[PDB]
Amino acid sequence: ALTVVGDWLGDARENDVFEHAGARDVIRREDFAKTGATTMREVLNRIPGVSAPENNGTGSHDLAMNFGIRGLNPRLASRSTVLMDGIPVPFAPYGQPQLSLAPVSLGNMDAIDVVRGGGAVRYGPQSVGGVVNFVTRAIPQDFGIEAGVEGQLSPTSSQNNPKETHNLMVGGTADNGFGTALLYSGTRGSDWREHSATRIDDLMLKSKYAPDEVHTFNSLLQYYDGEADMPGGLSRADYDADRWQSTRPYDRFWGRRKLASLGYQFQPDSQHKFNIQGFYTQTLRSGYLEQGKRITLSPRNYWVRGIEPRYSQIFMIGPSAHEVGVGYRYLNESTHEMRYYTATSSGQLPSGSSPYDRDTRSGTEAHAWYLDDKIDIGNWTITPGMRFEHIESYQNNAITGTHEEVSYNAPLPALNVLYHLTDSWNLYANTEGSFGTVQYSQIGKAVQSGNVEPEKARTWELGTRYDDGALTAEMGLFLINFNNQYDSNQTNDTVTARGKTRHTGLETQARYDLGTLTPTLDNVSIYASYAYVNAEIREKGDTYGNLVPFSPKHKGTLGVDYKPGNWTFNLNSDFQSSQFADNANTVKESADGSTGRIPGFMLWGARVAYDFGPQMADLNLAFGVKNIFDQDYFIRSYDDNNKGIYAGQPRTLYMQGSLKF
């Protein structure tokens, strides 16, 4: 009886995902614990087409987030549109989307929704890698208290401090329709590397007010605060002598974020839905970093404010149903970056009293409009769509006295198609216009070369999704042509060079109840995820034909979950093939360990859990192991100051505990 869907991202509803006309995968809170995951990257890695490397480089710590979709640069997760309840996670979404500080915590989430395709009309910028949305925990309908903790230790490491991650959820909704939940997640500890001591506190207050069935108010307040020493890379000599050690004693990172979001929804009936969301974030991200014969201090402050009204209405035009969606977003971001320094040869770290060699302020004003129409005709659901962004950015350098500006547009036409083969089998196809912005650090290059145009991509997908209850599976193909990237893929970046890469491949995953084969295998489920990704450099120049760095051609997971009675036994494997560390695709390792082929690996993990009388207090206990066979592997940071070899996580033991009242 015609019901407007409106926001198909939202809380990542199972049905919106199944009906999604493009590659989209969700992993819900229920499945976070099965592999001992406590971080965003550990869950993101179980998703096909997503590669989330272990901490390294600038992001050599837990406050940062590193991931790339389909072979796009994973460093600091800058090629996908990253959101939390639809709100921009980057402290500078447009001009500096690098998540050197990623103020989100797995502990505060009900799900992770990776929309690799079909979201380029409704979300931006940096939409080439699709959209990744972190869904915060729901406010309990009636009072609820949940708490959990996981402790980890790497026995073969010299690092004896453990890493502890905890989460707390307390909330409910009064009979008057007002509900709120306090969501707290914290991390304390070190990983398998020396000099990784970390503290993260992520406190959120989520509220909802629905005085009636027509008006609904929502809010999200967050105070995120953390600090972390950064292990950094080792030269090959140092790594062979002791791979746990750190030779970057001054490297440390810290930051804090304050966020306020307020939204309102007006739904008169089931065919019309108006939504307006407003937000403001303030972020400070800073840290010490050894650079040559100096140690620097880099405080960067950011302010982002946005307002986004959206409207959806569904009506019939003959036999076909048309759900028209229109939206607008005004976003303003402002920045201030400084860099103080001292000579390393001295004692003392740099401070506010040290001289400084950087003082810049940047900002962007962005107007985004979008219009789509989801047309249901017979077994078809066709959604033509169009996004248009007008972007104005500037960079003001207080030391050089330069003031540069760019004004540009991003027209992004799209068409996605869903075809219902059966009530449990869909087919989809699509094409979308995607884009990367002219980042603040590229404004100089953009004005100098005379060309100010966005980084443009055109994507195509074809795939199918299936779910008959005993078997869930999907398989899709994708093609991405990403042009005019301000970051050239040549060995030597020049003012006029523009990067150009092509990403093609196959993504798939499936889960099957073996109990359908024999009761001997009751409660035994087997699954696997896999993606073949071929990310190539197609920029004419000295790297034409080479492979994009940090993009394994093969990557996935396989596992078996066995749940007799109240027990849960998990077995899982993560595997990926090799990768290059640089655009030149150098095979042989450099002595400083920053470049050279990075071998693939296949790890195994397992866990045993027990849910004590689901009643009483829903106590869940678990003991698990990551990398059971202590398979050695490593990754490299190539370009950052803490470049080098980073040991991969060795055999790691963990215990989990959770309570629910």
Ligand X SMILES: CCCCCCCCCCCC[N+](C)(C)[O-]
Q: Which parts of 273-292 interact with ligand X (CB under 6 A)?
A: 276, 278-280
Q: Is 504 in the site for ligand X (CB under 6 A)?
A: yes
Q: Which is nearer to ligand X, 197 or 415 (CB)?
A: 415
Stretch that binds ligand X, among 129-137, 254-262, 578-586, 597-605 (CB under 6 A): 254-262
Interface of this chain with ligand X, residues 16 to 55, rule: CB under 6 A: none
Q: Which is nearer to ligand X, 342 or 430 (CB)?
A: 430
Q: Which is nearer to ligand X, 355 or 613 (CB)?
A: 613
Answer for which of 415, 447, 473, 528 binds ligand X (CB under 6 A) is 415
Answer for which of 70, 166, 252, 503 binds ligand X (CB under 6 A) is 166
The 3-state DSSP class for residue 447 equals helix
**Minimum distance from residue 344 beta carbon to ligand X (Å):** 27
The 3-state DSSP class for residue 519 equals helix
Question: Torsion-angle region of residue 384: left (phi > 0), alpha (psi -120 to 50) or beta?
Answer: beta
* Residue nearest to ligand X according to CB distances in the complex: 278
The 3-state DSSP class for residue 183 equals strand
**198 C-beta neighbours (distance < 10 Å), count:** 22
Site string for ligand X, 369-408 (x = CB under 6 A): --x-x----------xxx----------------------
**Minimum distance from residue 529 beta carbon to ligand X (Å):** 10
**Minimum distance from residue 296 beta carbon to ligand X (Å):** 22
Answer for which of 309, 515, 599, 600 binds ligand X (CB under 6 A) is 309
Interface of this chain with ligand X, residues 590 to 629, rule: CB under 6 A: 606, 608-610, 621-623
**Minimum distance from residue 566 beta carbon to ligand X (Å):** 7
**Minimum distance from residue 332 beta carbon to ligand X (Å):** 6
Stretch that binds ligand X, among 5-13, 236-244, 318-326, 577-585 (CB under 6 A): 318-326
Answer for which of 155, 268, 292, 564 binds ligand X (CB under 6 A) is 564
**Minimum distance from residue 568 beta carbon to ligand X (Å):** 8
* Nearest-angstrom CA–CA distance, 227 and 197: 8
Name the burial class of residue 432, with classes exposed (0-12), middle (13-18) and buried (19+) by CB atoms within 10 angstroms of its CB.
buried
Q: Is 322 in the site for ligand X (CB under 6 A)?
A: yes
Answer for which of 13, 28, 215, 336 binds ligand X (CB under 6 A) is 215
Four-point Cα dihedral 533, 534, 538, 539, nearest 10: 60
Q: Is 151 in the site for ligand X (CB under 6 A)?
A: no
CA distances from residue 177 to 143, 216, 592 in whole angstroms, order as listed: 13, 9, 60
Q: Is 437 in the site for ligand X (CB under 6 A)?
A: no
Q: Is 327 in the site for ligand X (CB under 6 A)?
A: yes
* Nearest-angstrom CA–CA distance, 646 and 581: 12
Residues in contact with 88: Cβ distance below 8 Å, sequence separation at least 6, in sequence order: 82, 279, 281, 304, 306, 331
**Minimum distance from residue 335 beta carbon to ligand X (Å):** 16
Stretch that binds ligand X, among 125-133, 255-263, 449-457, 541-549 (CB under 6 A): 255-263
As given in the structure block, the two tokens for residue 109 are: 């989430």
Beta strand 131-136 pairing with 81-84? parallel
* Nearest-angstrom CA–CA distance, 472 and 259: 38
Site string for ligand X, 188-207 (x = CB under 6 A): -------------x-x----
Interface of this chain with ligand X, residues 117 to 136, rule: CB under 6 A: none
Count of positions on this chain that bind ligand X (CB under 6 A): 78
Q: Which is nearer to ligand X, 313 or 344 (CB)?
A: 313
CA distances from residue 74 to 80, 204, 455 in whole angstroms, order as listed: 10, 27, 17
Question: Torsion-angle region of residue 505: left (phi > 0), alpha (psi -120 to 50) or beta?
Answer: left
**524 C-beta neighbours (distance < 10 Å), count:** 18
Name the burial class of residue 343, with classes exposed (0-12), middle (13-18) and buried (19+) by CB atoms within 10 angstroms of its CB.
exposed
As given in the structure block, the two tokens for residue 263 are: 């939204």
Q: Which is nearer to ligand X, 447 or 528 (CB)?
A: 528
The 3-state DSSP class for residue 293 equals coil
- DSSP E strands: which ranges in 230-271? 252-266
* Nearest-angstrom CA–CA distance, 524 and 242: 41
Q: Which is nearer to ligand X, 170 or 452 (CB)?
A: 170
**Minimum distance from residue 43 beta carbon to ligand X (Å):** 19
**Minimum distance from residue 249 beta carbon to ligand X (Å):** 22
**Spatial contact of 261 and 85, defined as CB atoms under 8 Å apart:** yes
Alpha helices (H) in 191-285, listed in sequence order:
236-241
Q: Is 315 in the site for ligand X (CB under 6 A)?
A: no
Stretch that binds ligand X, among 93-101, 241-249, 466-474, 562-570 (CB under 6 A): 562-570
Residue 158's DSSP bridge partners are: none
Stretch that binds ligand X, among 63-71, 354-362, 391-399, 558-566 (CB under 6 A): 558-566
Answer for which of 32, 184, 435, 638 binds ligand X (CB under 6 A) is 184
Q: Is 562 in the site for ligand X (CB under 6 A)?
A: yes
Q: Which is nearer to ligand X, 82 or 622 (CB)?
A: 622
* Nearest-angstrom CA–CA distance, 51 and 508: 14
Interface of this chain with ligand X, residues 328 to 347, rule: CB under 6 A: 328, 330
**17 C-beta neighbours (distance < 10 Å), count:** 18
Q: Is 152 in the site for ligand X (CB under 6 A)?
A: no
* Nearest-angstrom CA–CA distance, 465 and 426: 5
Which amino acid is it at 446? A
Interface of this chain with ligand X, residues 524 to 553, rule: CB under 6 A: 524, 530, 532
Task: Report which of 137, 70, 68 is spatially closest to residue 98, judged by C-alpha positions.
Answer: 68
**Minimum distance from residue 160 beta carbon to ligand X (Å):** 21
* Nearest-angstrom CA–CA distance, 136 and 171: 13
Site string for ligand X, 451-470 (x = CB under 6 A): -------x-x-x--------
Stretch that binds ligand X, among 87-95, 105-113, 237-245, 415-423 (CB under 6 A): 415-423
**Minimum distance from residue 262 beta carbon to ligand X (Å):** 4
Answer for which of 5, 138, 398, 477 binds ligand X (CB under 6 A) is 477
* Nearest-angstrom CA–CA distance, 187 and 5: 37
